[PDB]
mmCIF file of C-alpha atoms (C1' of nucleotides) and ligand atoms in Angstrom:
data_model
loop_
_atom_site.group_PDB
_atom_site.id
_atom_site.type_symbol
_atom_site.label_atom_id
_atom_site.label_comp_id
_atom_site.label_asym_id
_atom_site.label_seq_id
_atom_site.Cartn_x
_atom_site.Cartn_y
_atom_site.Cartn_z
ATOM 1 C CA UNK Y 1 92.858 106.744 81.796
ATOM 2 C CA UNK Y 2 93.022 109.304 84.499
ATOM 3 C CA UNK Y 3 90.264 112.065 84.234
ATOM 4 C CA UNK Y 4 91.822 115.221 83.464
ATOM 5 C CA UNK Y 5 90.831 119.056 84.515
ATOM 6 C CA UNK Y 6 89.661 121.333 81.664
ATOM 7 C CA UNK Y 7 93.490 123.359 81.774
ATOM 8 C CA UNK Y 8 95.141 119.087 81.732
ATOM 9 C CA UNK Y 9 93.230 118.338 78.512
ATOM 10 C CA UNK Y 10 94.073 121.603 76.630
ATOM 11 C CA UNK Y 11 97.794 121.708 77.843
ATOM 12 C CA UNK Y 12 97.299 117.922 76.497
ATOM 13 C CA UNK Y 13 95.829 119.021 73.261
ATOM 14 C CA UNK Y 14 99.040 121.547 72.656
ATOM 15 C CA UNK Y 15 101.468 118.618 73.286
ATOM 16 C CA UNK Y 16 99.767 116.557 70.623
ATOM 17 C CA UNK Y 17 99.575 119.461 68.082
ATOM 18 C CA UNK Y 18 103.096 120.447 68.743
ATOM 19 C CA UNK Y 19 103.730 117.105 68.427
ATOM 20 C CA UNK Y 20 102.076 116.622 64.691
ATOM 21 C CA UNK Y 21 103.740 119.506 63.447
ATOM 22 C CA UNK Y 22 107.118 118.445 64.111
ATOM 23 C CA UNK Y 23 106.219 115.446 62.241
ATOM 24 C CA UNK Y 24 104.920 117.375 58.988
ATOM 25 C CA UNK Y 25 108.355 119.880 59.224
ATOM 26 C CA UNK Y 26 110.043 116.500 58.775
ATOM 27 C CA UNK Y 27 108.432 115.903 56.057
ATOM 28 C CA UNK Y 28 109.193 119.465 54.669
ATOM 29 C CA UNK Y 29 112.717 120.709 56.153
ATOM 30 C CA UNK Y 30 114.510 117.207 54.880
ATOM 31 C CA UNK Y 31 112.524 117.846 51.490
ATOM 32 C CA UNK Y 32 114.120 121.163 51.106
ATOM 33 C CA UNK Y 33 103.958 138.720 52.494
ATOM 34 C CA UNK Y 34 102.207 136.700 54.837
ATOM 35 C CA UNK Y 35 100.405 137.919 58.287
ATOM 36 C CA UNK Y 36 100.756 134.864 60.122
ATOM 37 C CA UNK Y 37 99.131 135.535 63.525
ATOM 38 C CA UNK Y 38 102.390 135.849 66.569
ATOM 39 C CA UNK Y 39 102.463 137.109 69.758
ATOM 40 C CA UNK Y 40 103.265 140.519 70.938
ATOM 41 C CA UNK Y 41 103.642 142.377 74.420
ATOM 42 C CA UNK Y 42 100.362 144.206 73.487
ATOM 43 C CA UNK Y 43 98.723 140.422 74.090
ATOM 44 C CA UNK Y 44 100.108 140.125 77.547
ATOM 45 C CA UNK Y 45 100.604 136.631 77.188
ATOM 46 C CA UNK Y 46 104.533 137.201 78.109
ATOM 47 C CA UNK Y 47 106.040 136.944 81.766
ATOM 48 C CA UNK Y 48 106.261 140.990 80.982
ATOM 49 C CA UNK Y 49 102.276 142.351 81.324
ATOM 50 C CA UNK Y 50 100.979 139.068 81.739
ATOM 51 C CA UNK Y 51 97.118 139.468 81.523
ATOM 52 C CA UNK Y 52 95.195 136.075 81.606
ATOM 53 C CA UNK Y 53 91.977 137.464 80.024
ATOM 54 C CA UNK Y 54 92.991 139.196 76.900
ATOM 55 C CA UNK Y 55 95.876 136.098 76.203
ATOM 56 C CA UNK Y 56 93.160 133.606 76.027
ATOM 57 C CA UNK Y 57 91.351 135.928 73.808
ATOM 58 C CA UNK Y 58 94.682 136.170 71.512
ATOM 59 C CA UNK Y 59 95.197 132.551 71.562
ATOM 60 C CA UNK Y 60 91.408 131.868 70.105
ATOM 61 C CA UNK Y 61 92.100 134.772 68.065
ATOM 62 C CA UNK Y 62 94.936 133.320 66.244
ATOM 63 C CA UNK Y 63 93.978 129.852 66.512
ATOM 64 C CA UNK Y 64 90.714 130.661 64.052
ATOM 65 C CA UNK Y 65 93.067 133.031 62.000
ATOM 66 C CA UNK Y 66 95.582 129.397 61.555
ATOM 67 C CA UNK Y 67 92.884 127.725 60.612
ATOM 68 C CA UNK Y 68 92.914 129.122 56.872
ATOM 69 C CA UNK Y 69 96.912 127.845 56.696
ATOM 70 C CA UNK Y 70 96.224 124.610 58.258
ATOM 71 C CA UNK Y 71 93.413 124.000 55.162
ATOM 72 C CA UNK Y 72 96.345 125.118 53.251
ATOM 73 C CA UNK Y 73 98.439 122.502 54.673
ATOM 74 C CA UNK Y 74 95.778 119.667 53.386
ATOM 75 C CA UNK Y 75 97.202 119.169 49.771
ATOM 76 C CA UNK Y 76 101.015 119.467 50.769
ATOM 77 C CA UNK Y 77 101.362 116.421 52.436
ATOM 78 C CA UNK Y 78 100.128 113.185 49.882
ATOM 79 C CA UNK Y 79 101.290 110.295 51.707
ATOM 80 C CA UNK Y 80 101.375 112.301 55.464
ATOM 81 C CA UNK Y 81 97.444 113.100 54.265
ATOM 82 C CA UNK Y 82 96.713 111.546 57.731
ATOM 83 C CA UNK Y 83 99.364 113.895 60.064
ATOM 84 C CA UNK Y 84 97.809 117.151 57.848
ATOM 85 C CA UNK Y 85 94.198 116.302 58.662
ATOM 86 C CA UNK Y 86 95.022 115.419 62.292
ATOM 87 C CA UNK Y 87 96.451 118.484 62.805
ATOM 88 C CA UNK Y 88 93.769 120.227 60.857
ATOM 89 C CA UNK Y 89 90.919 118.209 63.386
ATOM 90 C CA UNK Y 90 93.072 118.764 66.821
ATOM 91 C CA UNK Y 91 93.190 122.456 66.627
ATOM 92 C CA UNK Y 92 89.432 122.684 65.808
ATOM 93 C CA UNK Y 93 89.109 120.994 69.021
ATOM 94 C CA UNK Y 94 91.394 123.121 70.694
ATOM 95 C CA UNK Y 95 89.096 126.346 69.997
ATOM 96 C CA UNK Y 96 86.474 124.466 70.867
ATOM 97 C CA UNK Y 97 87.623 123.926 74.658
ATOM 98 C CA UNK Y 98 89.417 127.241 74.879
ATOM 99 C CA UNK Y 99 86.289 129.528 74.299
ATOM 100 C CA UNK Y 100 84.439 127.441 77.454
ATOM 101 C CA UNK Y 101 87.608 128.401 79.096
ATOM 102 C CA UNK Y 102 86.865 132.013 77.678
ATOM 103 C CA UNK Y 103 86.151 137.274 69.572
ATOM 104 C CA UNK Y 104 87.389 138.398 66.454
ATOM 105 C CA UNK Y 105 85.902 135.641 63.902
ATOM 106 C CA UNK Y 106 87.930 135.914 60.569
ATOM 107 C CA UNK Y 107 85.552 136.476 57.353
ATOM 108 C CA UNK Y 108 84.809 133.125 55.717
ATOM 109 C CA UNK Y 109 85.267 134.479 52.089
ATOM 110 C CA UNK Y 110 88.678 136.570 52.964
ATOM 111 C CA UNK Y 111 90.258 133.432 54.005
ATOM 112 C CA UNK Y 112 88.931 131.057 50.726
ATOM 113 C CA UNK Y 113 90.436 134.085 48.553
ATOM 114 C CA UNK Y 114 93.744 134.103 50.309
ATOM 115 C CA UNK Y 115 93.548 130.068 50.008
ATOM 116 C CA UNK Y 116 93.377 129.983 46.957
ATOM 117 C CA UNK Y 117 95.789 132.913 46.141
ATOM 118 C CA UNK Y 118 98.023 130.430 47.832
ATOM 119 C CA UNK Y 119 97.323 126.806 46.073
ATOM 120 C CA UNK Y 120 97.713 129.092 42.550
ATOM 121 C CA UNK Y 121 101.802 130.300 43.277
ATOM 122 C CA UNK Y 122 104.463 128.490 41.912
ATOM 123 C CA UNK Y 123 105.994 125.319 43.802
ATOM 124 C CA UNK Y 124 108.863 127.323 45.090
ATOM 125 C CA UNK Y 125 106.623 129.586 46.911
ATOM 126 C CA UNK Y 126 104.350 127.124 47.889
ATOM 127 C CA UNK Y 127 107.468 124.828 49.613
ATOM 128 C CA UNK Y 128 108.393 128.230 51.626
ATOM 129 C CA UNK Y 129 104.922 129.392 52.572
ATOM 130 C CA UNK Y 130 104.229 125.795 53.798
ATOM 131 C CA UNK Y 131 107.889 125.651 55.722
ATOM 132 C CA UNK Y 132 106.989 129.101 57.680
ATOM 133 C CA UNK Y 133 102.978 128.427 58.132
ATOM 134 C CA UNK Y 134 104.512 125.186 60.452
ATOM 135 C CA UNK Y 135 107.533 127.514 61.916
ATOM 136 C CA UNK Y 136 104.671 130.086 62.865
ATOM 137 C CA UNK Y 137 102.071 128.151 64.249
ATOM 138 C CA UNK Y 138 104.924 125.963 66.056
ATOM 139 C CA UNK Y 139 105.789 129.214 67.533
ATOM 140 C CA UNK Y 140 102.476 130.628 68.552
ATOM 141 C CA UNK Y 141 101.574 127.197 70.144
ATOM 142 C CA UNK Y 142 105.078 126.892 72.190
ATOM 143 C CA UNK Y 143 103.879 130.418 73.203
ATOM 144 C CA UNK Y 144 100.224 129.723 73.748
ATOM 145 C CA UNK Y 145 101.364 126.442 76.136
ATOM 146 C CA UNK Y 146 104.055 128.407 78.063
ATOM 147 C CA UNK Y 147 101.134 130.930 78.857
ATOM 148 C CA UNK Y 148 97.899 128.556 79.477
ATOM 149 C CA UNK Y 149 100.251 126.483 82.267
ATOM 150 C CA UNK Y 150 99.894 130.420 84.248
ATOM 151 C CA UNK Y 151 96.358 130.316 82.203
ATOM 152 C "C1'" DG F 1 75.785 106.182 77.712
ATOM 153 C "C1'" DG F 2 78.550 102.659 78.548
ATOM 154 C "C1'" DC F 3 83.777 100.294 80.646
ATOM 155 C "C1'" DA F 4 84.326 106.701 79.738
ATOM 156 C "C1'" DG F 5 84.244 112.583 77.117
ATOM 157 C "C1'" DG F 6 82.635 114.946 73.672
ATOM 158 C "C1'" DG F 7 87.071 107.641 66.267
ATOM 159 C "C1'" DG F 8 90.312 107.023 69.184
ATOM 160 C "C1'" DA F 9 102.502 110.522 76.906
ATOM 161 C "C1'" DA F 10 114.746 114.092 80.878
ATOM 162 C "C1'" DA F 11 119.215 115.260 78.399
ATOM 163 C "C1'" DC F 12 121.476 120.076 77.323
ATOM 164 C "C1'" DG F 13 114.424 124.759 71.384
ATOM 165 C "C1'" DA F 14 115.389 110.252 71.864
ATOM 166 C "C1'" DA F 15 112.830 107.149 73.866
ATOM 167 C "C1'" DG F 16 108.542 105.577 73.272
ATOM 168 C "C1'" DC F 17 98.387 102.763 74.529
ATOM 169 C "C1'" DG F 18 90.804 100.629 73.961
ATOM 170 C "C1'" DG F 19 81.336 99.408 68.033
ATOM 171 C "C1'" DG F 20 77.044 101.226 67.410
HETATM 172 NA NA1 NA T 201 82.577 106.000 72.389
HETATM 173 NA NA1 NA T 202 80.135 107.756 70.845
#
DNA sequence: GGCAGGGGAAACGAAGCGGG
C-alpha cells in the first residue's frame, strides 16, 4: 500500500462513500419538507466564485448536518445492515480528516426529534425520504469531490 | 507500534485486495 497525502486519502474516502451509496440506492430504486444540506453559489465551491476556505467549511457543514439522515438510514436496510453502517462509519471519518484540513455544529436534540419524526411516518414516506436522503447526499458528495480535487 | 495509519481501486452521471 502506497502512502497517501492528506487530500489522496479524503478524495479516497469520497470514492468509497460514493461508492456505498450506490450500493444502498440499489437496494432502494429496484425496491420501488426536508432541508437536506446542497450546494449553492453562496458556498463558492463551484468553478463560478470558487473560494477554497469557506467550501471546506460547507462541506464539514453539511457532512455533520447528513449525519442525522445517515442514522436514519440504519433501520432501512435489514439484510444491507452492513453497507448502512459502513456508510454511517466512513463519513464520520471523513469529518474527522476534513476539519485537520480546516463550524456550525447541529444541536444534538434537534436532530433526535427530527429522527424520530422520521422513523414514526408511514412506509410510503419513509421509502421516499430514504430514496432522496441517498439522491442528496450522492449529490453533495459528487460536489464536495469535484471541489476538494481544486481543494 | 509493528510489516503500517488512525477492523480492515475507461466507455459515452462494467469490470473488478492483509491479532492483540
Ligand atoms: Na493494526
Ligand atoms: Na491497532
Amino acid at each position: 500500500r502506497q502512502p497517501l497525502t492528506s487530500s489522496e486519502r479524503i478524495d479516497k474516502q469520497i470514492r468509497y462513500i460514493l461508492d456505498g451509496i450506490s450500493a444502498l440506492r440499489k437496494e432502494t430504486c429496484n425496491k420501488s419538507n426536508l432541508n437536506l444540506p446542497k450546494m449553492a453559489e453562496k458556498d463558492g465551491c463551484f468553478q463560478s466564485g470558487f473560494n477554497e476556505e469557506t467550501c471546506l467549511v460547507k462541506i464539514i457543514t453539511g457532512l455533520l448536518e447528513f449525519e442525522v439522515y445517515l442514522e436514519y438510514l440504519q433501520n432501512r436496510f435489514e439484510s444491507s445492515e452492513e453497507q448502512a453502517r459502513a456508510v454511517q462509519m466512513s463519513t464520520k471519518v471523513l469529518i474527522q480528516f476534513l476539519q485537520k484540513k480546516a463550524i456550525t455544529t447541529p444541536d444534538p436534540t434537534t436532530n433526535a426529534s427530527l429522527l424520530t419524526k422520521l422513523q414514526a411516518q408511514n412506509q410510503w414516506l419513509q421509502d421516499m425520504t430514504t430514496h432522496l436522503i441517498l439522491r442528496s447526499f450522492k449529490e453533495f458528495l459528487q460536489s464536495s469531490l469535484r471541489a476538494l480535487r481544486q481543494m
